[PDB]
Design an enzyme around this catalytic site. Structure first.
Site, mmCIF file in Angstrom:
data_model
loop_
_atom_site.group_PDB
_atom_site.id
_atom_site.type_symbol
_atom_site.label_atom_id
_atom_site.label_comp_id
_atom_site.label_asym_id
_atom_site.label_seq_id
_atom_site.Cartn_x
_atom_site.Cartn_y
_atom_site.Cartn_z
ATOM 1 N N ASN A 28 -17.155 -24.901 43.618
ATOM 2 C CA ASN A 28 -16.031 -24.285 44.291
ATOM 3 C C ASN A 28 -16.299 -22.817 44.591
ATOM 4 O O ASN A 28 -17.268 -22.231 44.092
ATOM 5 C CB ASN A 28 -14.769 -24.419 43.435
ATOM 6 C CG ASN A 28 -13.570 -24.872 44.248
ATOM 7 O OD1 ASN A 28 -13.294 -24.331 45.324
ATOM 8 N ND2 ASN A 28 -12.854 -25.866 43.741
ATOM 9 N N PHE A 29 -15.450 -22.244 45.439
ATOM 10 C CA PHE A 29 -15.539 -20.843 45.798
ATOM 11 C C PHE A 29 -16.788 -20.432 46.568
ATOM 12 O O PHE A 29 -17.239 -19.287 46.482
ATOM 13 C CB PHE A 29 -15.378 -20.020 44.524
ATOM 14 C CG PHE A 29 -14.108 -20.327 43.784
ATOM 15 C CD1 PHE A 29 -14.111 -20.509 42.406
ATOM 16 C CD2 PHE A 29 -12.910 -20.482 44.480
ATOM 17 C CE1 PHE A 29 -12.943 -20.848 41.724
ATOM 18 C CE2 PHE A 29 -11.736 -20.821 43.813
ATOM 19 C CZ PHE A 29 -11.752 -21.005 42.428
ATOM 20 N N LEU A 30 -17.345 -21.379 47.317
ATOM 21 C CA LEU A 30 -18.516 -21.115 48.145
ATOM 22 C C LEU A 30 -18.065 -20.126 49.201
ATOM 23 O O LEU A 30 -17.028 -20.317 49.832
ATOM 24 C CB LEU A 30 -18.999 -22.393 48.833
ATOM 25 C CG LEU A 30 -19.867 -22.195 50.083
ATOM 26 C CD1 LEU A 30 -21.217 -21.583 49.705
ATOM 27 C CD2 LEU A 30 -20.067 -23.528 50.772
ATOM 28 N N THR A 51 -14.923 -30.523 47.556
ATOM 29 C CA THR A 51 -13.987 -30.820 48.616
ATOM 30 C C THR A 51 -14.217 -29.864 49.777
ATOM 31 O O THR A 51 -14.771 -28.785 49.606
ATOM 32 C CB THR A 51 -12.531 -30.712 48.100
ATOM 33 O OG1 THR A 51 -12.351 -29.471 47.405
ATOM 34 C CG2 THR A 51 -12.227 -31.858 47.147
ATOM 35 N N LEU A 53 -9.406 -26.824 43.074
ATOM 36 C CA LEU A 53 -8.880 -25.515 43.478
ATOM 37 C C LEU A 53 -9.195 -25.042 44.938
ATOM 38 O O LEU A 53 -9.419 -23.871 45.078
ATOM 39 C CB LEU A 53 -9.435 -24.473 42.496
ATOM 40 C CG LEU A 53 -9.213 -24.825 41.024
ATOM 41 C CD1 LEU A 53 -9.829 -23.793 40.070
ATOM 42 C CD2 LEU A 53 -7.729 -24.911 40.652
HETATM 43 C C1 MYA Z 1 -25.702 -32.345 40.825
HETATM 44 C C2 MYA Z 1 -25.457 -30.868 41.122
HETATM 45 C C3 MYA Z 1 -25.231 -30.601 42.616
HETATM 46 C C4 MYA Z 1 -24.274 -29.436 42.877
HETATM 47 C C5 MYA Z 1 -24.093 -29.112 44.368
HETATM 48 C C6 MYA Z 1 -23.012 -29.933 45.092
HETATM 49 C C7 MYA Z 1 -23.150 -29.854 46.631
HETATM 50 C C8 MYA Z 1 -21.889 -29.467 47.402
HETATM 51 C C9 MYA Z 1 -21.557 -27.968 47.354
HETATM 52 C C10 MYA Z 1 -20.793 -27.495 48.615
HETATM 53 C C11 MYA Z 1 -19.664 -26.474 48.327
HETATM 54 C C12 MYA Z 1 -18.284 -26.914 48.855
HETATM 55 C C13 MYA Z 1 -17.063 -26.574 47.940
HETATM 56 C C14 MYA Z 1 -16.368 -25.340 48.498
HETATM 57 O O1 MYA Z 1 -16.550 -24.256 47.961
HETATM 58 S S1 MYA Z 1 -15.315 -25.574 49.947
HETATM 59 C C15 MYA Z 1 -14.744 -23.853 50.263
HETATM 60 C C16 MYA Z 1 -15.693 -22.992 51.122
HETATM 61 N N1 MYA Z 1 -15.132 -21.716 51.571
HETATM 62 C C17 MYA Z 1 -14.362 -21.572 52.707
HETATM 63 O O2 MYA Z 1 -14.093 -22.525 53.438
HETATM 64 C C18 MYA Z 1 -13.806 -20.167 53.052
HETATM 65 C C19 MYA Z 1 -14.850 -19.213 53.705
HETATM 66 N N2 MYA Z 1 -15.841 -19.924 54.510
HETATM 67 C C20 MYA Z 1 -17.162 -19.550 54.547
HETATM 68 O O3 MYA Z 1 -17.603 -18.593 53.914
HETATM 69 C C21 MYA Z 1 -18.080 -20.416 55.437
HETATM 70 O O4 MYA Z 1 -18.661 -19.562 56.435
HETATM 71 C C22 MYA Z 1 -19.167 -21.247 54.629
HETATM 72 C C23 MYA Z 1 -19.939 -20.524 53.487
HETATM 73 C C24 MYA Z 1 -18.407 -22.409 53.947
HETATM 74 C C25 MYA Z 1 -20.218 -21.816 55.631
HETATM 75 O O5 MYA Z 1 -21.125 -20.808 56.115
HETATM 76 P P1 MYA Z 1 -21.763 -20.979 57.590
HETATM 77 O O6 MYA Z 1 -20.645 -21.351 58.678
HETATM 78 O O7 MYA Z 1 -22.462 -19.592 58.030
HETATM 79 O O8 MYA Z 1 -22.729 -22.241 57.604
HETATM 80 P P2 MYA Z 1 -24.279 -21.957 57.277
HETATM 81 O O9 MYA Z 1 -24.979 -21.381 58.599
HETATM 82 O O10 MYA Z 1 -24.521 -20.983 56.037
HETATM 83 O O11 MYA Z 1 -24.917 -23.406 56.916
HETATM 84 C C26 MYA Z 1 -24.233 -24.536 57.462
HETATM 85 C C27 MYA Z 1 -24.560 -25.828 56.707
HETATM 86 O O12 MYA Z 1 -23.847 -25.949 55.458
HETATM 87 C C28 MYA Z 1 -22.791 -26.926 55.621
HETATM 88 N N3 MYA Z 1 -21.471 -26.467 55.127
HETATM 89 C C29 MYA Z 1 -20.604 -25.521 55.647
HETATM 90 N N4 MYA Z 1 -19.468 -25.319 54.982
HETATM 91 C C30 MYA Z 1 -19.526 -26.169 53.941
HETATM 92 C C31 MYA Z 1 -18.666 -26.460 52.868
HETATM 93 N N5 MYA Z 1 -17.442 -25.918 52.582
HETATM 94 N N6 MYA Z 1 -19.124 -27.435 51.984
HETATM 95 C C32 MYA Z 1 -20.310 -28.048 52.150
HETATM 96 N N7 MYA Z 1 -21.187 -27.789 53.195
HETATM 97 C C33 MYA Z 1 -20.733 -26.863 54.015
HETATM 98 C C34 MYA Z 1 -22.791 -27.398 57.108
HETATM 99 O O13 MYA Z 1 -22.294 -28.712 57.333
HETATM 100 C C35 MYA Z 1 -24.232 -27.085 57.533
HETATM 101 O O14 MYA Z 1 -25.163 -28.100 57.189
HETATM 102 P P3 MYA Z 1 -25.464 -29.226 58.294
HETATM 103 O O15 MYA Z 1 -24.128 -30.008 58.714
HETATM 104 O O16 MYA Z 1 -26.159 -28.561 59.589
HETATM 105 O O17 MYA Z 1 -26.445 -30.282 57.593
#
Ligand code: MYA
Length: 422
Positions: free
Chosen positions: A136-138, A172, A422
């Protein structure tokens, strides 16, 4: 969009429209020995960092980064307002490690520009016990958008968790990514209509006066459920069992330990009203029995460009439980449903009263859990966003999200999503 996922197409996730027949891990098993102990390579000018929540300055850079960048549009006129209290609660649950609260700082300026965190939890997926993590909180700084930094954050966190022998996760997102195991809709219950309207968070339908709306959303000042009071440590054993019992009906849940449960529902003592994060309540009968439990948390927004208001109170309906239907064997028995609906409508109506009295301006709730039994009756209006639930490295059949195909609330099946992220 299914093939245009340059990064997710490389990950162990379910595929869209995939017909799951055997739920379980996707990748072939691994050992923490097959996991590099070295942090992944990062852009030359950047470097990884481990945020110590117990450090004033560091924790500060985190919520400052998130507050300035969480909303996508400078003209929004509002911003998130994460606090040190909020993160002390959310990031310091038992088992937490500074090593899992990751950030990216500019080498030269040491400026936080990215952040993502993981917390260990045990997920229950259709009875299956799965040691996992919740991400969370990405957040990536607006000036570093569309540079594909996110995939690196994800891969680096996946590595640190893997090195600890944990191979799954729940996350999520509002955006649609490879095969969500479920989707829920957001709803909003206006507690302070007049203010929501003035800060442009709700509209004024044609034909209605501002007076119609205010009266329509007006709420009583005091709660109505007898025996209802604040949760106390003394209550933990009973509430915990009541909660676990109720929760067992859902297919996707977090299996708390009494310790995690207590940390999560009884907040930090000595916090002013305007800073309190978690609000948990219980209903106790004359014989000492605890038959109900519900909670909500606070996450305010900062208001911009407004002469009258500069902050907006936002309460989020959280976890709850009741024994109202423990008398019937089948949850979907129309009798069990009626008994449960009447109790939830009562408890959650008091929840709105408590949230409003706590100065929350609007009350948020998803269509997860058994929420659709009360959502419409309690005036939680249909929100514009949806939330997709995902499972990393885990293949699972679709789980009801409480929505009909047309996006309206499915009041007869409700939802099998029991976790609240959250
Ligand atoms: C076993 C252990 C494993 C643990 C890890 C579990 C994995 C999951 C963890 C995930 C954490 C989620 C839980 C939360 O925290 S969800 C809450 C995230 N935060 C917000 O929505 C508020 C602010 N938003 C931002 O800062 C955005 O600009 C973010 C950082 C989200 C994207 O920044 P940006 O627009 O500049 O994109 P990029 O150029 O860096 O890179 C884009 C790539 O990343 C993919 N993307 C974008 N957004 C999300 C998102 N919310 N979940 C998963 N993937 C996401 C996207 O499809 C693309 O890949 P692809 O479609 O081309 O293939």
């Amino acid at each position: 969009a299914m093939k245009d996922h340059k990064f997710w197409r490389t990950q162990p996730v379910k595929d869209f429209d995939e017909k799951v027949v055997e739920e379980g891990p996707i990748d072939k098993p691994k050992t923490p020995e097959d996991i590099s102990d070295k942090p992944l390579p990062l852009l030359s000018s950047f470097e990884w960092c481990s945020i110590d929540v117990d450090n004033k300055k560091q924790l500060e850079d985190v919520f400052v980064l998130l507050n300035e960048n969480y909303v996508e549009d400078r003209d929004a006129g509002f911003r998130f307002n994460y606090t040190k209290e909020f993160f002390n609660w959310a990031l310091k649950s038992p088992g937490w490690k500074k090593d899992w609260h990751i950030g990216v700082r500019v080498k030269e300026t040491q400026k936080l520009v990215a952040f993502i965190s993981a917390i260990p939890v045990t997920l229950g997926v259709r009875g299956k016990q799965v040691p996992s993590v919740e991400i969370n909180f990405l957040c990536v700084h607006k000036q570093l958008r569309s540079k594909r930094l996110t995939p690196v954050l994800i891969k680096e966190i996946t590595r640190r968790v893997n090195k600890c022998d944990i191979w799954h996760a729940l996350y999520t997102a509002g955006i649609v990514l490879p095969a969500p195991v479920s989707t829920c809709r957001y709803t909003h219950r206006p507690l302070n209509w007049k203010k929501l309207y003035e800060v442009d968070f709700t509209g004024l339908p044609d034909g209605h006066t501002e007076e119609d709306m205010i009266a329509e959303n007006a709420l009583p000042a005091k709660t109505k459920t007898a025996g209802l009071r604040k949760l106390k440590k003394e209550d933990i054993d009973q509430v915990f069992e009541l909660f676990k019992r109720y929760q067992s009906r859902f297919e996707l849940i977090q299996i708390f330990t009494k310790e995690e449960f207590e940390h999560n529902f009884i907040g930090e003592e000595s916090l002013p009203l305007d800073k309190q994060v978690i609000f948990s309540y219980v209903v106790e009968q004359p014989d000492g029995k605890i038959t109900d439990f519900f909670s909500f948390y606070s996450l305010p927004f900062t208001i911009l460009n407004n002469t009258k208001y500069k902050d907006l109170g936002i309460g989020y309906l959280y976890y709850y439980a009741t024994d109202a239907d423990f008398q019937f064997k089948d949850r979907f028995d129309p009798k069990a449903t009626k008994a449960l609906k009447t109790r939830l409508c009562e408890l959650i109506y008091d929840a709105c009263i408590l949230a409003k009295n706590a100065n929350m301006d609007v009350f948020n709730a998803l269509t997860s859990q058994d929420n659709t039994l009360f959502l419409d009756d309690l005036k939680f209006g249909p929100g514009d966003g949806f939330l997709n639930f995902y499972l990393f490295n885990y293949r699972a059949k679709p789980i009801t999200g409480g929505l009909n195909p047309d996006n309206s609330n499915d009041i007869k099946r409700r939802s099998n999503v029991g976790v609240v992220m959250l």
